[model samples]
Target: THFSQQDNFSVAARVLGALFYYAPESAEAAPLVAVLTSDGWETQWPLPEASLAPLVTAFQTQCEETHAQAWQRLFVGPWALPSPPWGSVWLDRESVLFGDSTLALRQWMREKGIQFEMKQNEPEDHFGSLLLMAAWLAENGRQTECEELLAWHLFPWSTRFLDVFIEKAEHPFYRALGELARLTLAQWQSQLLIPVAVKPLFR
Candidate 1:
């Protein structure tokens, strides 16, 4: 069944990563978007129905013809992302990409001899990337690495990021995505008994 938390964690991590990391119209994101927009998915999800309600309703009712622009605005941005998805933005006072926190995470990754697939030169601390990386650790049965990744690199700054992400996503799809991310993140932290780093948040 889908009740195994480890399996659920891996699946949730990848799915959430895809939603946040890929553009809606991109080849990577299209199929999942269609499936999520359809009904019945909530039943299989790990989160309670009550928590899923708003997202489900928004998926149904919030009317905008396409999600491409919304994706661009939130993720890409010729302007500014309402919630910048990088960990460095929140962890470092400078609020810039590839800042000191990014370097710290990079150092940690090197220590663990870990590498992940991604676009060229993107920072390690991107919200989607961290979950994607965490998913990898679980899938490979590297439980210690997964917990450390969450406790140190991910959980420190993610709640703040998601709060802003949930508030500012502007599209129903992304708002729902933010909630999903937060919910799953909370579950993983609690279930794994992971210790979250107490860090200052800049944004």
Candidate 2:
């Protein structure tokens, strides 16, 4: 596989693991391969046996132990109940970037005809958003949609989350995953600056 292909799958495996393992409440929680490939890093952690096992099956032997370690730590190595506790811990109180940025994300999803399964007062950043977006793409036949979905949702808070994760993580593998998340943010920033031919209606 090419570097992009392998890295893409690696990240996808991670994202899948996170969703399937952390927030499996939604039917949409199944991982979409595009979610892995659309960005510089894969934030999703693959499911234990069913998702991660298959995602890494072809490449595990070829993947560096470091990569596998990072994924594993995020998946099951219990750092704590939340894995990453405290949302306000990383973002500045005045930060328009990460602090409860989920409102904007949820509004945007609503505008786009995306419906989140809301059980009143549930937080949008609860990881179910990715699964909902993944299922939308699968149903809509637009694989490339994952990037847009992620950009609107996870990217806002995730960089901050990555910072905290890197600092607090006990396992070496999770530290590396934190680095990967940061690396992807660098790339994601470049993409964000690219001028679109037309202005986005939402903004």
Candidate 3:
């Protein structure tokens, strides 16, 4: 395959999205841990190698622990998640999941005729799902839709959310995931000249 710019964004988006959205113990996410912690994977990362070094190290270290506990806390939650994963929680002042922004995204997806096979009954505005959807849009050559997804849906609140995610993440893998995702998205945003929406964050 020819090395094109979109490949980097789509691939990174998919990988990070899966890591963020699934538990480490899930069938979907477990294989990726080995891939991520393997040597030389960072060489091809979209960002500079040095920037990813610490995050890479963190992932390798955390992968050795009982990581499901951290995943449960961060994503599933019998109690509280230090950083809420839903876009609506951050975008809407109520700090509620399935808030206005989630519905707004559903409206946009419907208007655009985007089809998403959600694996669970959850709001579509989850940051992880958005990234995965972004990858699909790009991979399928829905170039315009992909950019709109970022400009309108993702860029608006992702940066703020990621900052909180990085700081509050209890596990090294998640902390690394947040940093890597942030760096990757920032790179894409600049490349596309996306004007991230200025919105107040409640969480």
The best candidate by lDDT is 1
Local accuracy by lDDT, each model: 0.83, 0.43, 0.81
Pairs with steric clashes in candidate 1:
none
lDDT by residue (1-203, candidate 2, tens digit) is 21212234334434533542343223433233224323422234322334333333332223344443443455445553323422222323543323445565567667767664544655555443454454445445444444455555555555556666667655433444445446544454454433312212111
Model 3 / residue 21 / CA error / Å: 1.0
Residues 65-143, candidate 3, lDDT per residue (tens digit)? Answer: 4678888888788898788878898888797888988888889899989997566778898888998998888888787
Cα RMSD to native, each candidate?
A: 2.2, 10.3, 2.4
Error of 3 at 162 (Å): 1.2
Model 1 agreement with the true structure over 33-133: per-residue lDDT tens digits: 88789888788777888888777777655556468888899889799889998999999999989998999999989999887655788888898898889
Worst 10 residues of 1 by lDDT: 1-10
Q: What TM-score does structure 2 among the candidates reach?
A: 0.45
TM-score of each: 0.93, 0.45, 0.91
* TM-score comparison, 1 vs 3, better candidate: 1
Best by TM-score: 1
Return the candidate ranking by lDDT, descending: 1, 3, 2
User: Which stretches of candidate 1 lie above 4 Å from their native place?
Assistant: 1-7
Model 3 bad stretches (over 4 Å): 1-7, 62-65
